[PDB]
Amino acid sequence: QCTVQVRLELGHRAQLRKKPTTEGFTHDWMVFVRGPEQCDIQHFVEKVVFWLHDSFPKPRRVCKEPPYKVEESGYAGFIMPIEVHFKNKEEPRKVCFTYDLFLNLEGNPPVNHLRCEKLTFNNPTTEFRYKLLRAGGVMV
Ligand SMILES: CC(=O)NCCCC[C@H](N)C(=O)O
């Protein structure tokens, strides 16, 4: 018996483009998944999948190594499914978040937002428990 907690940070940045794109997109934005300072989530994250709006081509964006991030231009915010796939052999294999990707509108300063997620793994296998603790996971 034991439980291991690890921390994830999902976030995004958005600002007006000085010059809109050829499509006339108003904003540059960037969405990421990272660990807190001095934590290496690569130890237990196999890959992160960023499910972009259907407008963007190849909207399935995969980061298999850090940095787990996507940079694009846009005209409006949307709901971005983000899938964090674990280096786990048993369940759960992944965790899904629906990320609120919103833009700074009507001359508000740039957007720079962070969403902190705590994952609780009950009775992980030996192999996966090492990866969690190597990433800076803590037993409770
Ligand atoms: C590039 C860009 O801005 N794409 C559109 C994103 C918003 C789509 C719409 N508001 C929706 O939520 O489906």
CSV table of N, CA and C and ligand atoms in Angstrom, one decimal:
chain,number,residue,atom,x,y,z
A,1,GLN,N,0.9,-1.2,0.0
A,1,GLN,CA,0.0,0.0,0.0
A,1,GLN,C,0.9,1.3,0.0
A,2,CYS,N,0.5,2.2,-0.9
A,2,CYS,CA,1.1,3.7,-0.8
A,2,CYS,C,0.4,4.5,-1.9
A,3,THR,N,0.6,5.8,-1.9
A,3,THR,CA,0.0,6.8,-2.8
A,3,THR,C,1.1,7.8,-3.1
A,4,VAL,N,1.3,8.1,-4.4
A,4,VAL,CA,2.3,9.1,-4.9
A,4,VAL,C,1.6,10.3,-5.6
A,5,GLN,N,1.9,11.5,-5.2
A,5,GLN,CA,1.3,12.8,-5.8
A,5,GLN,C,2.4,13.4,-6.6
A,6,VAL,N,2.1,13.9,-7.8
A,6,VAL,CA,3.0,14.7,-8.7
A,6,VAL,C,2.2,15.9,-9.1
A,7,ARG,N,2.9,17.0,-9.5
A,7,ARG,CA,2.3,18.3,-9.8
A,7,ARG,C,2.6,18.6,-11.3
A,8,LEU,N,1.5,19.1,-12.0
A,8,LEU,CA,1.6,19.5,-13.4
A,8,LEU,C,1.2,21.0,-13.4
A,9,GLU,N,1.8,21.8,-14.3
A,9,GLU,CA,1.4,23.1,-14.6
A,9,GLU,C,1.0,23.2,-16.0
A,10,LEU,N,-0.3,23.5,-16.3
A,10,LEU,CA,-0.7,23.9,-17.6
A,10,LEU,C,-0.9,25.4,-17.6
A,11,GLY,N,-0.6,26.0,-18.7
A,11,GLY,CA,-0.7,27.5,-18.9
A,11,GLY,C,-0.7,27.9,-20.3
A,12,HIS,N,-0.8,29.2,-20.5
A,12,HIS,CA,-0.8,29.8,-21.9
A,12,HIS,C,-0.6,31.3,-21.8
A,13,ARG,N,0.0,31.8,-22.9
A,13,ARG,CA,0.3,33.2,-23.1
A,13,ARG,C,-0.4,33.7,-24.3
A,14,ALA,N,-1.0,34.9,-24.4
A,14,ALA,CA,-1.6,35.5,-25.5
A,14,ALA,C,-1.3,37.0,-25.6
A,15,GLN,N,-1.0,37.5,-26.8
A,15,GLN,CA,-0.8,38.9,-27.0
A,15,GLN,C,-1.3,39.3,-28.4
A,16,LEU,N,-1.6,40.6,-28.7
A,16,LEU,CA,-1.9,41.1,-30.0
A,16,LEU,C,-0.6,40.9,-30.9
A,17,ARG,N,-0.8,40.5,-32.1
A,17,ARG,CA,0.3,40.6,-33.2
A,17,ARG,C,0.4,42.1,-33.6
A,18,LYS,N,1.6,42.6,-33.7
A,18,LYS,CA,1.9,44.0,-34.3
A,18,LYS,C,1.3,44.0,-35.7
A,19,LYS,N,1.6,42.9,-36.5
A,19,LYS,CA,1.1,42.6,-37.8
A,19,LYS,C,0.3,41.3,-37.9
A,20,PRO,N,-1.0,41.4,-38.1
A,20,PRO,CA,-1.8,40.2,-38.4
A,20,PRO,C,-1.2,39.3,-39.5
A,21,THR,N,-1.5,38.0,-39.5
A,21,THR,CA,-1.0,37.0,-40.5
A,21,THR,C,-1.6,37.2,-41.9
A,22,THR,N,-1.3,36.4,-42.8
A,22,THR,CA,-2.0,36.4,-44.2
A,22,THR,C,-3.5,36.1,-44.1
A,23,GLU,N,-3.8,35.3,-43.1
A,23,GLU,CA,-5.3,35.0,-42.8
A,23,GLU,C,-5.9,36.1,-41.9
A,24,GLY,N,-5.0,37.0,-41.4
A,24,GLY,CA,-5.4,38.2,-40.6
A,24,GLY,C,-5.6,37.8,-39.1
A,25,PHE,N,-5.0,36.7,-38.6
A,25,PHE,CA,-5.1,36.4,-37.2
A,25,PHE,C,-4.5,37.5,-36.3
A,26,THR,N,-5.2,37.9,-35.3
A,26,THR,CA,-4.9,39.1,-34.4
A,26,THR,C,-3.8,38.8,-33.4
A,27,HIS,N,-3.8,37.5,-32.9
A,27,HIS,CA,-3.1,37.1,-31.6
A,27,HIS,C,-2.0,36.1,-32.0
A,28,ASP,N,-0.9,36.1,-31.3
A,28,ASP,CA,0.0,35.0,-31.0
A,28,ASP,C,-0.3,34.4,-29.7
A,29,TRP,N,-0.4,33.1,-29.6
A,29,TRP,CA,-0.6,32.5,-28.3
A,29,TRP,C,0.3,31.2,-28.2
A,30,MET,N,0.5,30.8,-27.0
A,30,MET,CA,1.4,29.7,-26.7
A,30,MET,C,0.8,28.9,-25.5
A,31,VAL,N,0.5,27.6,-25.6
A,31,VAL,CA,0.0,26.7,-24.6
A,31,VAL,C,1.1,25.7,-24.2
A,32,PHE,N,1.2,25.3,-22.9
A,32,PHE,CA,2.3,24.4,-22.4
A,32,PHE,C,1.8,23.5,-21.3
A,33,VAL,N,2.5,22.4,-21.1
A,33,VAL,CA,2.5,21.6,-19.9
A,33,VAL,C,3.9,21.5,-19.4
A,34,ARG,N,4.2,21.8,-18.1
A,34,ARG,CA,5.5,21.7,-17.5
A,34,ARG,C,5.4,21.2,-16.1
A,35,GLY,N,6.5,20.9,-15.5
A,35,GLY,CA,6.6,20.6,-14.0
A,35,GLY,C,6.8,21.9,-13.2
A,36,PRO,N,6.7,21.9,-11.9
A,36,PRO,CA,7.1,23.0,-11.1
A,36,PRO,C,8.7,23.1,-11.1
A,37,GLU,N,9.3,24.2,-10.6
A,37,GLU,CA,10.7,24.4,-10.6
A,37,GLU,C,11.5,23.1,-10.1
A,38,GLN,N,12.5,22.7,-10.7
A,38,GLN,CA,13.4,21.6,-10.3
A,38,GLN,C,12.7,20.2,-10.4
A,39,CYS,N,11.6,20.1,-11.1
A,39,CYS,CA,10.9,18.8,-11.3
A,39,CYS,C,11.0,18.5,-12.8
A,40,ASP,N,11.3,17.2,-13.1
A,40,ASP,CA,11.5,16.8,-14.5
A,40,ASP,C,10.4,15.7,-14.8
A,41,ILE,N,9.2,16.2,-15.3
A,41,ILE,CA,8.0,15.4,-15.6
A,41,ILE,C,8.3,14.4,-16.8
A,42,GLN,N,9.4,14.6,-17.5
A,42,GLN,CA,9.7,13.7,-18.7
A,42,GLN,C,9.9,12.2,-18.2
A,43,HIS,N,10.3,12.1,-16.9
A,43,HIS,CA,10.5,10.8,-16.3
A,43,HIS,C,9.2,9.9,-16.4
A,44,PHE,N,8.0,10.5,-16.2
A,44,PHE,CA,6.7,9.8,-16.2
A,44,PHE,C,5.7,10.3,-17.3
A,45,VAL,N,6.1,11.3,-18.1
A,45,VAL,CA,5.2,11.8,-19.2
A,45,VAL,C,5.8,11.2,-20.5
A,46,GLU,N,5.1,10.3,-21.2
A,46,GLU,CA,5.5,9.7,-22.5
A,46,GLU,C,5.4,10.7,-23.6
A,47,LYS,N,4.3,11.5,-23.6
A,47,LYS,CA,4.0,12.6,-24.5
A,47,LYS,C,2.8,13.4,-24.0
A,48,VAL,N,2.7,14.6,-24.5
A,48,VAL,CA,1.5,15.5,-24.4
A,48,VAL,C,0.9,15.7,-25.8
A,49,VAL,N,-0.4,15.6,-25.9
A,49,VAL,CA,-1.1,15.8,-27.2
A,49,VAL,C,-2.0,17.0,-27.0
A,50,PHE,N,-1.8,18.0,-27.8
A,50,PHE,CA,-2.6,19.3,-27.8
A,50,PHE,C,-3.6,19.2,-29.0
A,51,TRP,N,-4.9,19.1,-28.7
A,51,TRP,CA,-6.0,19.0,-29.7
A,51,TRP,C,-6.5,20.4,-30.1
A,52,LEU,N,-6.0,20.9,-31.2
A,52,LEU,CA,-6.2,22.3,-31.6
A,52,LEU,C,-7.6,22.3,-32.2
A,53,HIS,N,-8.2,23.6,-32.4
A,53,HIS,CA,-9.4,23.9,-33.1
A,53,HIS,C,-9.3,23.3,-34.5
A,54,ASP,N,-10.5,22.8,-35.1
A,54,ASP,CA,-10.6,22.0,-36.3
A,54,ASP,C,-10.1,22.9,-37.5
A,55,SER,N,-10.1,24.2,-37.4
A,55,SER,CA,-9.6,25.2,-38.4
A,55,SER,C,-8.2,25.0,-38.7
A,56,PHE,N,-7.3,24.9,-37.7
A,56,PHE,CA,-5.9,24.7,-37.8
A,56,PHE,C,-5.7,23.3,-38.5
A,57,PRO,N,-4.7,23.2,-39.4
A,57,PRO,CA,-4.4,21.9,-40.1
A,57,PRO,C,-3.4,21.1,-39.2
A,58,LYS,N,-3.5,19.8,-39.4
A,58,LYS,CA,-2.9,18.8,-38.4
A,58,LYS,C,-3.1,19.3,-37.0
A,59,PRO,N,-4.4,19.3,-36.5
A,59,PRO,CA,-4.7,19.8,-35.2
A,59,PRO,C,-4.2,18.9,-34.0
A,60,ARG,N,-3.9,17.7,-34.3
A,60,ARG,CA,-3.2,16.8,-33.3
A,60,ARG,C,-1.8,17.1,-33.2
A,61,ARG,N,-1.4,18.0,-32.3
A,61,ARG,CA,0.0,18.4,-32.0
A,61,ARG,C,0.6,17.5,-30.9
A,62,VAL,N,1.7,16.8,-31.1
A,62,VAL,CA,2.4,15.9,-30.2
A,62,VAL,C,3.7,16.5,-29.8
A,63,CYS,N,4.0,16.5,-28.5
A,63,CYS,CA,5.3,16.8,-27.9
A,63,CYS,C,5.7,15.5,-27.1
A,64,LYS,N,6.7,14.8,-27.6
A,64,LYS,CA,7.1,13.5,-27.0
A,64,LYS,C,8.2,13.8,-26.0
A,65,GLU,N,8.9,14.9,-26.1
A,65,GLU,CA,9.9,15.4,-25.1
A,65,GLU,C,9.7,16.8,-24.8
A,66,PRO,N,10.2,17.3,-23.7
A,66,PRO,CA,10.1,18.8,-23.3
A,66,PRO,C,10.8,19.6,-24.4
A,67,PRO,N,10.3,20.9,-24.6
A,67,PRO,CA,9.2,21.5,-23.9
A,67,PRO,C,7.9,21.0,-24.5
A,68,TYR,N,6.9,20.7,-23.6
A,68,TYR,CA,5.5,20.3,-24.0
A,68,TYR,C,4.8,21.6,-24.2
A,69,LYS,N,4.7,22.1,-25.5
A,69,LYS,CA,4.1,23.4,-25.8
A,69,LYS,C,3.7,23.4,-27.3
A,70,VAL,N,2.8,24.3,-27.7
A,70,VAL,CA,2.3,24.6,-29.0
A,70,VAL,C,2.3,26.1,-29.1
A,71,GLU,N,2.8,26.7,-30.2
A,71,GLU,CA,2.7,28.1,-30.5
A,71,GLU,C,2.0,28.3,-31.8
A,72,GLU,N,0.9,29.1,-31.9
A,72,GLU,CA,0.1,29.4,-33.0
A,72,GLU,C,-0.3,30.8,-33.0
A,73,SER,N,-1.0,31.2,-34.1
A,73,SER,CA,-1.7,32.5,-34.2
A,73,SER,C,-3.2,32.3,-34.3
A,74,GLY,N,-4.0,33.2,-33.9
A,74,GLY,CA,-5.5,33.0,-33.9
A,74,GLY,C,-6.3,34.3,-33.9
A,75,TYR,N,-7.6,34.2,-34.0
A,75,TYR,CA,-8.5,35.3,-34.0
A,75,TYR,C,-9.4,35.3,-32.7
A,76,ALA,N,-9.6,34.1,-32.2
A,76,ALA,CA,-10.4,33.9,-30.9
A,76,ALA,C,-9.9,32.7,-30.1
A,77,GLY,N,-10.2,32.7,-28.8
A,77,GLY,CA,-10.0,31.6,-27.9
A,77,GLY,C,-10.9,30.4,-28.2
A,78,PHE,N,-10.6,29.2,-27.6
A,78,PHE,CA,-11.4,28.0,-27.7
A,78,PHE,C,-11.0,27.0,-26.6
A,79,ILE,N,-11.7,25.9,-26.5
A,79,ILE,CA,-11.5,24.8,-25.5
A,79,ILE,C,-10.5,23.8,-26.1
A,80,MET,N,-9.4,23.7,-25.5
A,80,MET,CA,-8.3,22.8,-26.0
A,80,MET,C,-8.2,21.5,-25.1
A,81,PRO,N,-8.7,20.4,-25.6
A,81,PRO,CA,-8.4,19.1,-25.0
A,81,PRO,C,-6.8,19.0,-25.0
A,82,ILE,N,-6.3,18.7,-23.8
A,82,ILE,CA,-4.8,18.3,-23.6
A,82,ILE,C,-4.7,17.0,-22.9
A,83,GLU,N,-4.0,16.0,-23.6
A,83,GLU,CA,-3.9,14.6,-23.1
A,83,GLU,C,-2.4,14.5,-22.6
A,84,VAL,N,-2.2,14.2,-21.3
A,84,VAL,CA,-0.9,13.8,-20.8
A,84,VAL,C,-0.8,12.3,-20.7
A,85,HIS,N,-0.1,11.6,-21.6
A,85,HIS,CA,0.1,10.2,-21.6
A,85,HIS,C,1.3,9.8,-20.7
A,86,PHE,N,1.1,8.8,-19.8
A,86,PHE,CA,2.1,8.4,-18.8
A,86,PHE,C,2.9,7.3,-19.3
A,87,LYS,N,4.1,7.1,-18.8
A,87,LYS,CA,5.0,5.9,-19.0
A,87,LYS,C,4.6,4.8,-18.0
A,88,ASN,N,3.3,4.5,-18.0
A,88,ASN,CA,2.7,3.5,-17.1
A,88,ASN,C,2.3,2.3,-17.9
A,89,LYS,N,2.4,1.1,-17.4
A,89,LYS,CA,2.0,-0.1,-18.1
A,89,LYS,C,0.6,-0.4,-17.8
A,90,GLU,N,0.1,-0.2,-16.6
A,90,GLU,CA,-1.3,-0.4,-16.1
A,90,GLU,C,-2.0,0.9,-16.1
A,91,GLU,N,-3.3,0.9,-15.6
A,91,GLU,CA,-4.2,2.1,-15.6
A,91,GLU,C,-3.8,3.1,-14.4
A,92,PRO,N,-4.0,4.4,-14.5
A,92,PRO,CA,-4.4,5.0,-15.8
A,92,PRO,C,-3.2,5.2,-16.7
A,93,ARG,N,-3.5,5.2,-18.0
A,93,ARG,CA,-2.4,5.3,-19.1
A,93,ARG,C,-2.2,6.8,-19.4
A,94,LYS,N,-3.2,7.6,-19.1
A,94,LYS,CA,-3.2,9.1,-19.5
A,94,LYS,C,-4.2,9.8,-18.5
A,95,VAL,N,-4.3,11.1,-18.7
A,95,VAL,CA,-5.3,12.0,-18.0
A,95,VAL,C,-5.5,13.1,-19.1
A,96,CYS,N,-6.8,13.4,-19.3
A,96,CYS,CA,-7.3,14.5,-20.2
A,96,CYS,C,-7.7,15.7,-19.4
A,97,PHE,N,-7.4,16.9,-19.8
A,97,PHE,CA,-7.8,18.2,-19.3
A,97,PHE,C,-8.5,18.9,-20.5
A,98,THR,N,-9.5,19.7,-20.2
A,98,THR,CA,-10.1,20.7,-21.2
A,98,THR,C,-9.6,22.0,-20.8
A,99,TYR,N,-8.7,22.6,-21.6
A,99,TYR,CA,-8.0,23.9,-21.3
A,99,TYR,C,-8.7,25.0,-21.9
A,100,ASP,N,-9.0,26.0,-21.0
A,100,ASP,CA,-9.7,27.3,-21.4
A,100,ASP,C,-8.7,28.2,-22.1
A,101,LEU,N,-8.4,28.1,-23.4
A,101,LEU,CA,-7.5,29.0,-24.1
A,101,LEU,C,-8.2,30.3,-24.5
A,102,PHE,N,-8.1,31.4,-23.8
A,102,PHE,CA,-8.7,32.7,-24.0
A,102,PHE,C,-7.6,33.8,-24.4
A,103,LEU,N,-8.1,34.8,-25.1
A,103,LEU,CA,-7.2,35.8,-25.7
A,103,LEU,C,-7.4,37.2,-25.0
A,104,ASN,N,-6.4,38.1,-25.0
A,104,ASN,CA,-6.6,39.4,-24.4
A,104,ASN,C,-7.2,40.3,-25.5
A,105,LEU,N,-8.5,40.8,-25.2
A,105,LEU,CA,-9.3,41.4,-26.2
A,105,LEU,C,-9.5,42.9,-25.8
A,106,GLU,N,-9.7,43.8,-26.8
A,106,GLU,CA,-10.0,45.3,-26.6
A,106,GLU,C,-8.9,45.9,-25.8
A,107,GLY,N,-7.6,45.7,-26.2
A,107,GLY,CA,-6.4,46.4,-25.6
A,107,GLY,C,-6.1,46.1,-24.2
A,108,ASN,N,-6.5,45.0,-23.7
A,108,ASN,CA,-6.1,44.5,-22.3
A,108,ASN,C,-4.7,44.0,-22.5
A,109,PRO,N,-3.9,44.1,-21.4
A,109,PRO,CA,-2.5,43.6,-21.5
A,109,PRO,C,-2.4,42.2,-21.9
A,110,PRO,N,-1.2,41.6,-22.4
A,110,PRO,CA,-1.1,40.2,-22.7
A,110,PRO,C,-1.6,39.3,-21.6
A,111,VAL,N,-2.0,38.1,-21.9
A,111,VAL,CA,-2.5,37.0,-21.1
A,111,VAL,C,-1.3,36.1,-20.7
A,112,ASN,N,-1.2,35.8,-19.5
A,112,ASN,CA,-0.1,34.9,-19.0
A,112,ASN,C,-0.7,34.2,-17.7
A,113,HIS,N,-1.3,33.0,-18.0
A,113,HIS,CA,-2.1,32.3,-17.0
A,113,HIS,C,-1.5,30.9,-16.7
A,114,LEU,N,-1.7,30.4,-15.5
A,114,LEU,CA,-1.1,29.1,-15.0
A,114,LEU,C,-2.3,28.4,-14.3
A,115,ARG,N,-2.4,27.1,-14.6
A,115,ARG,CA,-3.4,26.2,-14.0
A,115,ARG,C,-2.6,25.0,-13.4
A,116,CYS,N,-2.6,24.9,-12.1
A,116,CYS,CA,-1.8,23.9,-11.4
A,116,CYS,C,-2.7,22.7,-11.1
A,117,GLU,N,-2.3,21.5,-11.5
A,117,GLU,CA,-3.0,20.2,-11.4
A,117,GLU,C,-2.2,19.3,-10.5
A,118,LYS,N,-2.8,18.7,-9.5
A,118,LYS,CA,-2.2,17.6,-8.6
A,118,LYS,C,-2.7,16.3,-9.1
A,119,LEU,N,-1.8,15.3,-9.4
A,119,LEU,CA,-2.2,13.9,-9.8
A,119,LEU,C,-1.9,13.0,-8.6
A,120,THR,N,-2.9,12.2,-8.1
A,120,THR,CA,-2.8,11.2,-7.1
A,120,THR,C,-2.8,9.8,-7.7
A,121,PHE,N,-1.7,9.1,-7.6
A,121,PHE,CA,-1.6,7.7,-8.1
A,121,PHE,C,-1.6,6.7,-6.9
A,122,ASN,N,-2.7,5.9,-6.9
A,122,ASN,CA,-2.9,4.9,-5.8
A,122,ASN,C,-2.2,3.6,-6.3
A,123,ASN,N,-1.2,3.1,-5.5
A,123,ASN,CA,-0.6,1.8,-5.7
A,123,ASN,C,0.0,1.6,-7.1
A,124,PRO,N,0.8,2.6,-7.5
A,124,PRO,CA,1.5,2.4,-8.8
A,124,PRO,C,2.4,1.2,-8.8
A,125,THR,N,2.6,0.5,-9.9
A,125,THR,CA,3.7,-0.5,-10.1
A,125,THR,C,5.0,0.0,-9.6
A,126,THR,N,6.0,-0.9,-9.4
A,126,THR,CA,7.3,-0.5,-8.9
A,126,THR,C,8.0,0.5,-9.9
A,127,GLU,N,8.0,0.0,-11.1
A,127,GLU,CA,8.6,0.7,-12.3
A,127,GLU,C,8.1,2.2,-12.4
A,128,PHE,N,6.8,2.3,-12.4
A,128,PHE,CA,6.1,3.6,-12.6
A,128,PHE,C,6.3,4.5,-11.3
A,129,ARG,N,6.3,3.9,-10.1
A,129,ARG,CA,6.5,4.6,-8.8
A,129,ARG,C,7.9,5.3,-8.8
A,130,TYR,N,8.9,4.6,-9.4
A,130,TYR,CA,10.3,5.2,-9.5
A,130,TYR,C,10.2,6.5,-10.4
A,131,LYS,N,9.6,6.4,-11.6
A,131,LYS,CA,9.5,7.5,-12.6
A,131,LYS,C,8.8,8.7,-11.9
A,132,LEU,N,7.7,8.4,-11.1
A,132,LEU,CA,6.9,9.5,-10.4
A,132,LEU,C,7.9,10.2,-9.4
A,133,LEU,N,8.6,9.5,-8.6
A,133,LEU,CA,9.5,10.0,-7.5
A,133,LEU,C,10.7,10.7,-8.2
A,134,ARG,N,11.3,10.1,-9.2
A,134,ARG,CA,12.4,10.7,-10.0
A,134,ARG,C,12.0,12.0,-10.6
A,135,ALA,N,10.7,12.2,-10.9
A,135,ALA,CA,10.1,13.5,-11.5
A,135,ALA,C,9.9,14.5,-10.4
A,136,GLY,N,10.1,14.1,-9.1
A,136,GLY,CA,9.8,14.9,-7.9
A,136,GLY,C,8.5,14.6,-7.3
A,137,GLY,N,7.9,13.4,-7.5
A,137,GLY,CA,6.7,12.9,-6.8
A,137,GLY,C,7.0,12.7,-5.3
A,138,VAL,N,5.9,12.8,-4.5
A,138,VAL,CA,6.0,12.6,-3.0
A,138,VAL,C,5.0,11.6,-2.5
A,139,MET,N,5.5,10.6,-1.7
A,139,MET,CA,4.6,9.6,-1.1
A,139,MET,C,3.8,10.2,0.1
A,140,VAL,N,2.6,9.7,0.4
A,140,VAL,CA,1.7,10.3,1.5
A,140,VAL,C,1.3,9.2,2.4
B,1,LIG,C1,-7.4,30.5,-35.5
B,1,LIG,C2,-8.6,30.6,-34.7
B,1,LIG,O1,-8.9,31.6,-34.0
B,1,LIG,N1,-9.5,29.6,-34.7
B,1,LIG,C3,-10.9,29.7,-34.1
B,1,LIG,C4,-10.9,29.3,-32.7
B,1,LIG,C5,-12.3,29.6,-32.1
B,1,LIG,C6,-13.4,28.7,-32.6
B,1,LIG,C7,-14.8,28.9,-32.0
B,1,LIG,N2,-14.9,30.1,-31.1
B,1,LIG,C8,-15.1,27.6,-31.1
B,1,LIG,O2,-15.1,27.6,-29.9
B,1,LIG,O3,-15.5,26.6,-31.7
